[PDB]
Structure formats: C-alpha cells, structure tokens
Amino acid sequence: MEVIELNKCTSGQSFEVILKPPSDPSLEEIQKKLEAAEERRKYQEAELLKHLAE
Amino acid sequence: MREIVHIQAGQCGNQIGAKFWEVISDEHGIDPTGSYHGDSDLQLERINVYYNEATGNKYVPRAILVDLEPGTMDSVRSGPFGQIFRPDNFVFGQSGAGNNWAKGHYTEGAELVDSVLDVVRKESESCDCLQGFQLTHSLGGGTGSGMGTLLISKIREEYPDRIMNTFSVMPSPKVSDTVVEPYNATLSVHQLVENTDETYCIDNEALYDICFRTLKLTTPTYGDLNHLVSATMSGVTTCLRFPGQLNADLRKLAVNMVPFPRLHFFMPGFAPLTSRQQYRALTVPELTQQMFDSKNMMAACDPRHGRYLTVAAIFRGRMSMKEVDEQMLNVQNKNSSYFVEWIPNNVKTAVCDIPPRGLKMSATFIGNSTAIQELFKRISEQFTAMFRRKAFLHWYTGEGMDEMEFTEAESNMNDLVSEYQQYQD
Amino acid sequence: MYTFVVRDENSSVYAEVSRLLLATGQWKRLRKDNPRFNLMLGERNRLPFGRLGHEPGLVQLVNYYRGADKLCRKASLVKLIKTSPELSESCTWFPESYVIYPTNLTDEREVFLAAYNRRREGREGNVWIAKSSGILISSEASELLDFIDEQGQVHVIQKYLEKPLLLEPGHRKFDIRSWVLVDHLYNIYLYREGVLRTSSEPYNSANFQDKTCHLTNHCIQKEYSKNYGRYEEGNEMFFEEFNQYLMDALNTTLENSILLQIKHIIRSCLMCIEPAISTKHLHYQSFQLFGFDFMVDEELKVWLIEVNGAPACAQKLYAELCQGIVDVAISSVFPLAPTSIFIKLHHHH
Amino acid sequence: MRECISIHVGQAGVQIGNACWELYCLEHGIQPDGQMPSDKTIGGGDDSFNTFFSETGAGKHVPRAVFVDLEPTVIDEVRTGTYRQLFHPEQLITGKEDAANNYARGHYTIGKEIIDLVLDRIRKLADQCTGLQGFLVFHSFGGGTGSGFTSLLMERLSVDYGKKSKLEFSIYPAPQVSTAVVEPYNSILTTHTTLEHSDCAFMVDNEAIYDICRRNLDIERPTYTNLNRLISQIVSSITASLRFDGALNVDLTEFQTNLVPYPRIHFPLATYAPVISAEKAYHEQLSVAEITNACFEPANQMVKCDPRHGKYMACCLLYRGDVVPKDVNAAIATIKTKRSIQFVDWCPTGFKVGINYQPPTVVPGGDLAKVQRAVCMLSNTTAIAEAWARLDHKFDLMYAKRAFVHWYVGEGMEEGEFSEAREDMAALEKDYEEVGVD
Ligand SMILES: Nc1nc2c(ncn2[C@@H]2O[C@H](COP(=O)(O)OP(=O)(O)OP(=O)(O)O)[C@@H](O)[C@H]2O)c(=O)[nH]1
Ligand SMILES: Nc1ncnc2c1ncn2[C@@H]1O[C@H](COP(=O)(O)OP(=O)(O)CP(=O)(O)O)[C@@H](O)[C@H]1O
Ligand SMILES: Nc1nc2c(ncn2[C@@H]2O[C@H](COP(=O)(O)OP(=O)(O)O)[C@@H](O)[C@H]2O)c(=O)[nH]1
Ligand SMILES: [Ca+2]
Ligand SMILES: [Ca+2]
Ligand SMILES: [Ca+2]
Ligand SMILES: [Mg+2]
Ligand SMILES: [Mg+2]
Ligand SMILES: [Mg+2]
C-alpha cells in the first residue's frame, strides 16, 4: 500500500497506489475496395436492367 | 423531405386509394380543398411525405390515379375529397380491361402506360429526395392487376434503386366478380415476387369474415370492406407520416422486415374492431391481444399455422408506453414457439401520440409470417382446378399470351410456397 | 406460464425437476436454444453465464453458481482452504492436503516431502492418498509422486484417515453424503436426509493394495466387492438406522456427534466464497445443489473429503428432494397459482 | 497545450455529442453564444480548456468538433437549437438519405461519395491546431452510418493522421431502445474493420444506461434525452483530464499507456457513481468509501458483466468534488478485504487516482441531482468480453441462415466480409480468455 507520484495543483491532485508488484491499408488500397464494391453494384444493376430489357 | 409517390390503379385500386387519402387527409388536418385547418404541429411535421405544397399554402396529394375505363375515376372526382387531387394526375383510357390480366399488361395497358410514366416522372422531378412508390390495386381484375404490375416493372426500370411498395387486394371466391380471378392473381404474384420490396396482402375473404362475424354486418358491401382497408393503410403508414424513429422510411422498414428478398409479403392487422359497446375504453392488454388475434388480421391465414420471421407493431394514442412494452414482451414470451428463434429480437414496437379519428387509441400489426403460404396455396389450387382443363384460357391467348406463361407463373408461386415452408421448420 | 430450457440431459436430479415442473401445468419447456426462458437447467461445463439476464421482461434464473467450481475441484478446494483466512491453513476439519503437478508440466512437492519426512521420523502414521478430478493409497512418498508423473493432470496428496469409524458388525468403512441447496438469496439449506455409502468389506489397515475396503464409492462396491448389499440395501444406510446405531453402540446421537460438525463445515465453506459468487446484485439469479462428502474417524470427529457441484441423489430420496428444490429454489422466484424438509443454516451475509 | 478534435457520426454520435458540448460549456462557463467571461485572454490562449475550444477575435469559444450524418433531420436540431451559435456551418455535415441501418450502405455506397468532404472539413480544424493530439469519435454500433461510415473514417484518419491517437465512445446495441434487427451484423462488421485503428474505446451498452435511468432516476420509460444526459456525465468524467489542469491522463496517448497494455484488448469498462434523482426530496450525501465501493457493483457499470470472474489489467479512479487522497486509499484498502479483485500476473495490482475538486456539473432542469462528490472508474477487465459473447451469439443465429445478408451484398459488400469479421471476433474472444482464465 504505497503512494507514488503525487502531483498537486490548484484544481486537484493525482497519484498512484500500488498494492502488490507483478509476477494498415494505404490510401490506394482503400480506394480499390470502395471501387471494387461500386463495380459489383454496377454489375448487379446492369443484370437487373438486362433482365428488364428481355 | 423523403417523398413517397402514390399510385392507384383499376376499380379496386382507386376506390381504396380514395378512402385512404380521405382518412389520412383528416388525420393531417387537410380539408377537401387541400387547405390545412389542424391544430397540432405534428400534423405538418412530415406532411410533405405524401402531400405537395402548392400556391396559397395548399396541400395536394402526391397521387396518380390510373384506369383503363373512366367510370370509377369519375366517381372519385365527384367523391368527397375528389377536388383535392391534381387534375393532371388522372390518367385513363376508354376500352376497359375486361377483368383480363393480359389486356392490362400486354395490350390495352401497354397503350396507356407511357402517359402514366410521364406523370410519375413529373412528380419525381419535384421531389427533394424520393423514397420510393406505393401502389394500391387488386390482383383479381385486369387493370390494377395487369397494368399495375406493368407499371411496377417500368417504374423499377427507370428508378431501380428506389423502394417499391404495394397494397395488394387478393381475390376470394366468397367475394368474387369473375371466375378468372385466380388466373389474374397468379400472374400478378409472379410479378410482385420479383419487382416489389414490400407487399401488404389484403385478402377479401378476411375482410368479409371480419365484416360479417366480428362487425356483425349482415350483408357486407365493397364499401364496408374498404373501411377496414382504409384503417389498415393509415395504420401501417403512421411510421412514415408522423415523427418517429422506428421504420421511419421505406428502406429501413424493408431492412427490418425482409430477411430474404422474395419473402416480402406481409399480413396486416388492426385493433380494435368493434361493432355498433363502441364507446368503451380499450386497455393496452386488450389492444395487444386483439392485434395478435387471427380474427383481427386481413390475410385469412392462421398465424398459429406458421412462424413469424419479423413483426412490426404501431400503437397510436396517449397511453402508457411502459405498459405497451410489458404487453408486447408478454405476447412474445407467452408464445415464443410462433417466432423464429434464429432472428433475435424480431418484434419491433413503435408509438404515435395521434390516434385515428374517433378512437382513444389503436394498434396496427404488420407480420412477415410463413403462414402467408396458405394464401398462395388457395390461389394455386383454384388456378390448377381451371388450368388443368385449360378453362377460360381463350380470353388470354386471344391477347397474344401462351400457355407456357401460365405454367411459369404457377411454378414460381409454388416455389414461393415451398420457400415459406422451409423457413417454417 | 413460466418457461424453462433443459441443457443437461444426463442429470437425473433436474430430469425429475423438469418432470415435476411440467406436472404443475404452469411451466412450459422450450427448446434448449430458445433465449426467452425464465429458468435454465444448464450444462455442467462452459455454462454461458454471460448470456443470462439480458432479456427485457424476463426474470432469469439458473441452477448453477458461477465460480462454485473453486469449491468443487480437488485442486481448487485445497488452494481455497490454504489461502482463505476464513478457512486458514490451520483448518481442523480438512485433511492435510497438497497440490502436486506432474513433472511433465504453484506446486507443493517439496512442502509435502517436508511434512512427510517429519512423520516418518516421528514414528507417526505416514499413509497418504493421491487422487484427482485413478486413486492410489500408499505409505511411501516415492510411489505417490511416481504415480502422478505417469499421469498428465493435476493431483492432490492428502492424509489418509488411518483411524476411520468402523460400523459393526462388519468392521467396515463408510462416508456420509449431505445434500445442500443454496437459493438466490444465498440461504443455505441442508436436506434433512443424508446417506452413508458403506463398504461391505472389513477394513484392513495392513493392505492398501485391495482398494475395495478403503474406497466407499458405490460403483466400486458394486463392481469389485463380493459382500455388496449384505448389511444394507445397496451399501446405503440412511440417517434413521445410522442414528439408532450411534445410540446402541456409542450411546450418542447423530445430531450431537456428527451433524453439528457437518453443519459447521457446510456453513464455513459456502460463507467463505459468498462474496465471489453471490448473485444478490446481479442481473440474473443463481441457485445450486451441492453434494458434500464427509469422513468420520473413531473419535467421532468429522472431516471434509470433497464437494460435488453436480451430485446425484439416493434412489429412495429423489422424490422428496426434487420437490424441495422446486419449493425453495424455483417457486420462490416464480410462485405458482410442512414442516420443511430442509434445515436452514443461519448466517451473516 | 495540444488540441483534441471530436467527431460525431450518425444519430447516436450527434445526439450524444450535443449533450456533451452542452455540459462542457456549463463546466467551463461558456454561454450558448460562445462567450467566456472568465477567459481573460481574448481571441487566444493555450489553457487546458483550449484543447477542446478554439477562440475567435470577437471572443467566441468554438468547439473543435465535426458533426456528420447521412441524413439532415438530426443535425438540423443543432443548427436551430440552444447552441446553434457555438458551431459554424462548416462543422455540421449532413446528407440527404441515410444508410438504412445497413453497414455496407454507409461504408461503401454512401460513404464513398462523402468521405472526402468530411476529411476536408476535419482538415480545416486540424489547421487551427499547433499540436493536434488526436480524435475522439462518437458513434453507435447498430446504425448504418454509425457503424459503416465510422470504420471508413477511421481507416482514412489513420492514413491522413498516422501519428495521432484515436479514441472511441461507442453505443452497444440494446433491444429495449432499438428497432433494427441487423444491429448485431453492423456491430461486428464495424468492430472488425475499426479494431486496428482505435487505440482505446469506451463501450456503453444502452441496456445499462436504460436500467440506471429506471432504477436510480425513477424514469419508467427513459428517452434518448435521459440516456444522453447521463452518458455525457460519464464522457465528461473521462475527458475532464484533457480539459482541466492536472497530471493524470493529460493527453490521449496516456489513455493507451494507462488502460491498454495489449493493443487489441482496448475496451475499458466504465463504472459511475452516484446517480441520484433530482426529484428526490433530498439525498444523504454519499462518502468517498460509499461511492468507491459502488464502482464494484454491476448495477452502475456502463456494460452489465461480472468483473469478479475476469482479471484486471489496469484501473483508474477519476474523482470529482470533495475528495482527498487519504480517504481514497482508506476506501480502496477496505474494498480489497471484501471484494474479488484479481489482476493478471504480468501487471501490477494498483490504481491510478485522479481528483478534480470541482464537483460534477448538472444541467439545469436535468434528471441528475447535485452531489458533493462523484467517481468514474475505468477498469480494463476481461469480463467485458461477455458483451462480445452476447453479440457474436446473435450474429451466429442470423448468419447461419444468411438472414438479411442480401441487403449487404446488394450494396456491393462481399459475403466473405461477414465470415472475415466473425473470425476476427472469435480471435478477440480467444485473446480475452487467454488473459483472464487459467
Ligand atoms: N444512447 C443513445 N443511443 C442511440 C441514440 N440514437 C440512436 N441510438 C442507438 O443507435 C442505434 C441506431 O443507430 P443510429 O445511430 O440511430 O443510426 P445512424 O448512425 O444514424 O445510421 P443510419 O442507419 O444511416 O440512420 C440503436 O441501437 C439506437 O438505440 C441516442 O441518442 N442515444
Ligand atoms: N483422505 C482420505 N482419507 C480416508 N479416505 C479417503 C480419503 N480421501 C478419499 N477417501 C475415500 O475415497 C472415497 C471417495 O474418494 P473421493 O470422493 O475423493 O473420489 P470421488 O470424488 O471420485 C467420489 P465422490 O465425488 O462421489 O465423493 C471415499 O468414500 C473415502 O472413503
Ligand atoms: N376490397 C375491395 N375489393 C374490390 C373492390 N372492387 C373490386 N374488388 C376486388 O378486385 C377484383 C376485381 O378487380 P377490379 O379492381 O374490379 O378490376 P380492375 O378495375 O380491372 O383492376 C375482385 O377480386 C374484387 O373482389 C373494392 O372496392 N374493395
Ligand atoms: Ca386500342
Ligand atoms: Ca483565452
Ligand atoms: Ca493508427
Ligand atoms: Mg371491377
Ligand atoms: Mg467427485
Ligand atoms: Mg440515422
């Protein structure tokens, strides 16, 4: 039960008590994923329109 | 500003659509001349979803009336709120469709469809952000069924990323005009399965049984039936017309109600349904019990014969929201064998402070139940009884159709039935 | 209409409880995976406590205390008794035990040898028993440690009661099973009926090789003993007969000589771990049935052997106890539309 | 001084953000018009409150905040609300149609078309910072925007601000105040793609906040306003160290150093006390020991779970009001002799304590009552993994049938992203179990 690093200021204080000791994707890749998803949407819509054209 | 474009087609479609705009116009404070005279700001908070604002602070429904004969739409124009519709939004022919799906879809309807789409396009070009469309029609006739599904196909082609919603009146031999209604309904169900995102199945037999057994109407008329449809249409659209967070738009409703794209056919329910003991107050337990009772549903399908994939419930009026949650959780926990367990928390409840006209409070029920397969089973059986003898086909082959098209529509509806059966087990 | 799910099909106890619940006509059984339940008769292992109590509008109850394994594990119990000040290392009603990990894997090997060597030097009885959650009784520490290394699981070496109380006629060993029910309020109820699982073979202190007269397990007596069912039906003596014996032979009662210590031991164990497993302020509630096994020496001193977290019941007592479980554990939270069969062991929470 | 930029995404993020900045102003003495009479340095200054507020020449103190929603109705409340004058229009970004509770719609379809605009607005705020620390991101798990667009924004923030810390305040879905069935899908999808980009995330389960409001505040049916006022108190207690003079958690980097020894396990449990109803006749003010002991009751945790059956990796006590160190240690010592507090063997058994003498500020007319002292405990317990277990179970139930999957594939997402995200959660649950169980 030891108190360490006590710091006091006008608006408060802080300290530490120890009870016991111990024992990314690049900008390029993000754009591809967004465009890859957009392409699959375009493909799906074109298939719907192809279906409606028949 | 999430505008919805309304379309009503055929005799049934226009007669029910007329009453719908009559009921919600009263709820929003709009009089027959489009002038607002309400007393609450909630009435206008979302008024633009269904109404356009013209000069002089006039509110004009965003509705397009379609038919292949003039008669019914002449009655609407002479009806109570007939003057409130935009005169240019009346699109009609003179030949009629003779209760013939082929005439509405392929011959007579095709001649008129381009002019209907001109009006739809005009209404869309003025929308800040168009949600989608809602169509009212019957499936047993020719115009609403055949031309209605033709409009849907072409609206989907021009607006492929908007939501398509329908109120579809299913035919019943107990409330029948012609023997070919199962032919026309099977051909339409084929279209609906592919091209709509949400379809409220309104069975004319359920409406009849409710008028006769529950409402105690000796000789029910089409008018009596349309009262139930008016009240139900106003209930299921409350989430769109008033401020709220649940199913507040068409796409979010679909996301919560449709777990598989073909299984988008809903059973609507309404409570109370009282015969003329009509002044008695209705408690939240009673509203919940009736709203889930089969006798209060309008698809003529016993829910205890299937399971609920999803459920949407709307309670209207000033009431204990705490008691609403308790009763809704009581229904689920007391009959959880009728709710699929592989969709957690599949029952959603919304509240609205404005009750329908002449009621302290009500509840509207929306169910995606596998028991709807019973409705398509009845149609398929009536279809096959005639089609196995090719009876009455000449009305359709005379308009250029082939028997193969009947076989295909039949197979798809039988697949739909099978698809419902697999998720019921 | 209350709802429950069954997730342990091999539980004779709660199979009867489920049977009783349905008989009331006020309980409905749901599929084992349906989350809208009031009561879960859970599985023995990896019970998903983290999913309980998150159902709006359902008061959820389960028949196991999360964390009670600390008490119902051979190695866990030893560690709990030695490390808990409430029980202390000097606890007088638990045999001197040690946790011994096989060398192929803290470990109390050297601490055990120290106590062992002291007994060997002091001419004292130096017979120990090794076991784990496959038992070996020996007086040589070399055999005890070598036996555990041949296995791959943690074991416990505790003193073997070389002076057990022997019933007569027969000169035979035995052990006492006590059933204890802790409800959601952490009341400790001791079932008024216990059973003595007796050995039908004369106790022999000069031969620990034949383990039929030293181990009073019902399965061992009925499989390797030749006098099974000779003195009592199924090697099971009940309190009525056993109490009459204590009076005729020892001029004393079961309550004074034995039951006081048993109630004191039960209280001490369960009260010790109450802060760790209590569901008082939890979003769900727990109860659990426990099977305490005791040993009685020739001095009428009671020793705790182990605690079973999923015990079975004596065939003759399933009906009474299972009904008792429904009265104080299930209906107390979910009431329905005496002379209790339990003895409440009062204590400070 | 070093600035912090707050980003609020979706309805939950925006509405919670509105409630926090309302509270920040009352705590710092800032009026709805942005004026701060106590600030004697007009038009500038590097005081502790300047980490969250910039200053104009006219003396307006402007939050360093960006609000983003794919639909305008929620952010339109900010534009015409009480604090409409705090923010300039560049800070409030709205689209026309939302993500329809669809992660893929917010992340791909809609997110792709608005991500560059949002980054541009964030860049404007960053250009006002002489030493930007990082970002605080508020969002829900269950909404399409809160889930889908946030993960896209976090990915880009890591690209455009590599050396900057990012903390989250995330709303965990609760059926009692939810109307979207697919929220388990969105929660797991957004956690998978955000995990590597968030240094520290404070999860708030709406279920916990809902029941605190009903039990402690006697609200029979809490609203979002009730929930958000309480959440902003907890958020305020967590960020107070960045906005006031002090020596504990003085910059965003210190949150990771103090609460997160393992990067993937960066979800600390928050516990707050006392929560007292303003409608009470009058309350017996609670002591340091009583409010501290309340930090170990499941009933005041932001996520219901049982810390008695996990292991602690760190613990911070953040006190506000009349509290001196002597009374804190006396309470801690008494709690160790009665509570089950098990640390991991590779961490010290200790507590970092911060005390702010200014008691919690209460919004006039709000629900909470003025108390003389309050505490928020931030503990990194493996027991919070119970929330992942609940969530992954619901995910598994729907995905086994592919229920609703077509809505995501229809927006351009590949079905394999479902299994990829779920496998990542399985690994997350395994990491917790390796650390907490023996
Ligand atoms: N605590 C709290 N939770 C909220 C609030 N608003 C929404 N939620 C929760 O957030 C989830 C819904 O996500 P939203 O944030 O509303 O959705 P969104 O971010 O706007 O994304 P969209 O789908 O495009 O609307 C549900 O679990 C709600 O309970 C709020 O103000 N406070
Ligand atoms: N320290 C000891 N001294 C004397 N006898 C002992 C003993 N430890 C165990 N025994 C004997 O072993 C028998 C059962 O041992 P134990 O209970 O540890 O195994 P077990 O747990 O597989 C059976 P159960 O779980 O049903 O009680 C008891 O009947 C007892 O007679
Ligand atoms: N509920 C209801 N059903 C109607 C009404 N009018 C017709 N129907 C049903 O609709 C079918 C006939 O279709 P109808 O709309 O008259 O043909 P259409 O004008 O070519 O579309 C039959 O099944 C009728 O039972 C009505 O006013 N209300
Ligand atoms: Ca013609
Ligand atoms: Ca200044
Ligand atoms: Ca990073
Ligand atoms: Mg007709
Ligand atoms: Mg055992
Ligand atoms: Mg939103």
Within 13 Å and on the Cβ side, how many CA atoms surround D226?
22
Residue D345 Cα to ligand 3 middle (Å): 76
> B127 with B51: CB under 8 angstroms?
no
Residue B42 Cα to ligand 7 middle (Å): 38
Q: Is D296 exposed, middle or buried (0-12, 13-18, 19+ CB in 10 A)?
A: buried
Query: Is D179 known to sit in a ligand binding site?
Result: yes
In angstroms, the separation between the Cα of residue D246 and the nearest Cα of chain C is: 35
Residue B347 Cα to ligand 4 middle (Å): 49
Question: Residue holding tokens 């074109």?
Answer: A46
Of the candidates C258, C263, C239, the residue with the CA atom closest to the CA atom of residue C343 = C263
Q: Helix, strand or coil for residue B151?
A: helix
Query: Is D18 known to sit in a ligand binding site?
Result: no
Ligand 2 within 6 A of C133 CB? no
**What's D35's DSSP letter?**
-
DSSP annotation string for B399-420: TT--HHHHHHHHHHHHHHHHHH
Longest dimension (CA), chain C: 68
Q: Which ligand is nearest to the CA of C175?
A: 2
* Chain A contact for D350 (CB, 8 A cutoff): yes
Residues in CB range of B107: below 8 A, 6 or more apart = B399, B400
CB spacing of B345 vs D221 below 8 angstroms: no
Rounded Cα gap, residues A3 and A15, in angstroms: 7
Residues in CB range of D435: below 8 A, 6 or more apart = D262, D265, D311, D313, D344, D382
| Long-range interactions of C221-226: CB distance < 8 A, separation 24+ | C221/C197, C225/C199, C225/C200, C225/C201, C226/C200, C226/C201
Q: Helix, strand or coil for residue B113?
A: helix
Question: Tokens in use for B14?
Answer: 């226009």
Rounded Cα gap, residues A25 and D421, in angstroms: 16
Please tell me whether the peptide bond between B268 and the residue prior to it is cis, using omega within 30 degrees of 0. no
> D137 with D166: CB under 8 angstroms?
yes
Rounded Cα gap, residues D138 and D157, in angstroms: 14
Residues in CB range of C309: below 8 A, 6 or more apart = C64, C68, C69, C71, C72, C288, C290, C291
Atom 8 in ligand 2: residue holding the nearest Cα: C305
Question: Tokens in use for C341?
Answer: 């069969």
Of the candidates B304, B353, B355, the residue with the CA atom closest to the CA atom of residue B331 = B304
Residue B240 amino acid letter: L
> C154 with C132: CB under 8 angstroms?
yes
DSSP annotation string for C58-98: ---EESS-TTTHHHHSHHHHHHHHHH-TTT-TT-SSS--EE
Resolution, angstroms, 1 dp: 2.1
Of the candidates B195, B25, B27, the residue with the CA atom closest to the CA atom of residue B105 = B195
Rounded Cα gap, residues D230 and D210, in angstroms: 10
Of the candidates B311, B265, B244, B250, the residue with the CA atom closest to the CA atom of residue B6 = B250
Atom of ligand 1 nearest to the CA of D173: 27
Name the residue of B65, B138, B151, B184 whose CB sits within 8 Å of the most ligand 3 atoms, as the mutation to test its pocket: B138
Question: Residue holding tokens 């108390």?
Answer: D371
Q: Would you list the domain boundaries of chain B?
A: 1-259, 260-371, 372-425
Of the candidates C41, C47, C42, the residue with the CA atom closest to the CA atom of residue C19 = C41
Residue spans of beta strands (DSSP E) within C145-222? 155-159, 174-182, 188-191, 195-198
Question: Tokens in use for D242?
Answer: 């960045």
Question: Tokens in use for B383?
Answer: 């279809």
> D361 with D211: CB under 8 angstroms?
no
Question: Tokens in use for A11?
Answer: 């608006």
Of the candidates B232, B292, B180, B242, the residue with the CA atom closest to the CA atom of residue B49 = B242
- C-alpha triplet C214, C215, C220: angle, nearest 5°: 130
Active-site residue, D433 included: no
Of the candidates B161, B160, B159, B181, the residue with the CA atom closest to the CA atom of residue B172 = B181
> C3 with C41: CB under 8 angstroms?
no
- C-alpha triplet A24, A30, A34: angle, nearest 5°: 150
> How many Cβ atoms are within 10 Å of C123's Cβ, its own excluded?
7
Question: Residue holding tokens 């961490």?
Answer: D347
Rounded Cα gap, residues B48 and B345, in angstroms: 32
Contacts of B325 in chain C (CB under 8 A): 56-57
Element holding B286 (H helix, E strand): helix B284-292
A and C interact (at least 3 Cβ pairs within 8 A):
no
Compute φ and ψ for C72, nearest 5 degrees: -105, 20
Query: Is D216 known to sit in a ligand binding site?
Result: no
Q: Helix, strand or coil for residue B380?
A: helix
Question: Tokens in use for B155?
Answer: 């609206």
Deposited experimental method: X-ray
Within 13 Å and on the Cβ side, how many CA atoms surround C221?
28
Please report how the helices D206-215 and D224-243 are oriented relative to each other, as an axis angle in degrees rounded to 10.
110
Smallest Cβ–Cβ distance between C66 and the set D309, D385, D389 belongs to D309
Q: Is C339 exposed, middle or buried (0-12, 13-18, 19+ CB in 10 A)?
A: exposed
Alpha helix (H) residue ranges in D206-354? 206-215, 224-243, 252-259, 288-294, 325-336
Question: Tokens in use for B294?
Answer: 């089969």
CB spacing of C50 vs D389 below 8 angstroms: yes
* Chain B contact for D389 (CB, 8 A cutoff): no
> B61 with B35: CB under 8 angstroms?
no
Question: Residue holding tokens 């959601």?
Answer: C184
Q: Nearest residue of D to residue B253 by CA position?
A: D100
Rounded Cα gap, residues D187 and D182, in angstroms: 9
> C265 with C295: CB under 8 angstroms?
no
Residue C309 amino acid letter: G
> C296 with C167: CB under 8 angstroms?
no
> How many Cβ atoms are within 10 Å of B33's Cβ, its own excluded?
11
Residue B138 Cα to ligand 3 middle (Å): 5
> B288 with B327: CB under 8 angstroms?
yes
Rounded Cα gap, residues B178 and B221, in angstroms: 17
**From residue C265, how far is each of C87, C165, C194 by CA, in Å?**
10, 19, 15
Identify the bridge partners of residue D185 per DSSP, sorted by sequence position. Answer: none
**What's C122's DSSP letter?**
T
Touching subunits for chain B (3+ Cβ pairs under 8 A): A, C, D
> B57 with B31: CB under 8 angstroms?
no
Ligand 3 within 6 A of B96 CB? no
Please tell me whether the peptide bond between B272 and the residue prior to it is cis, using omega within 30 degrees of 0. yes
Residue B371 Cα to ligand 7 middle (Å): 29
Of the candidates D14, D31, D3, the residue with the CA atom closest to the CA atom of residue D242 = D3
Contacts of D390 in chain C (CB under 8 A): 50-51, 54
> C268 with C87: CB under 8 angstroms?
yes
Q: Which of D254, D414, D415, D423 is catalytic?
A: D254
Question: Tokens in use for B201?
Answer: 């199945």
Which residue positions of B form the known binding site for Mg(2+)?
Answer: 69
In angstroms, the separation between the Cα of residue C25 and the nearest Cα of chain B is: 14
> A30 with D156: CB under 8 angstroms?
yes
Touching subunits for chain C (3+ Cβ pairs under 8 A): B, D
Atom of ligand 3 nearest to the CA of B185: 23
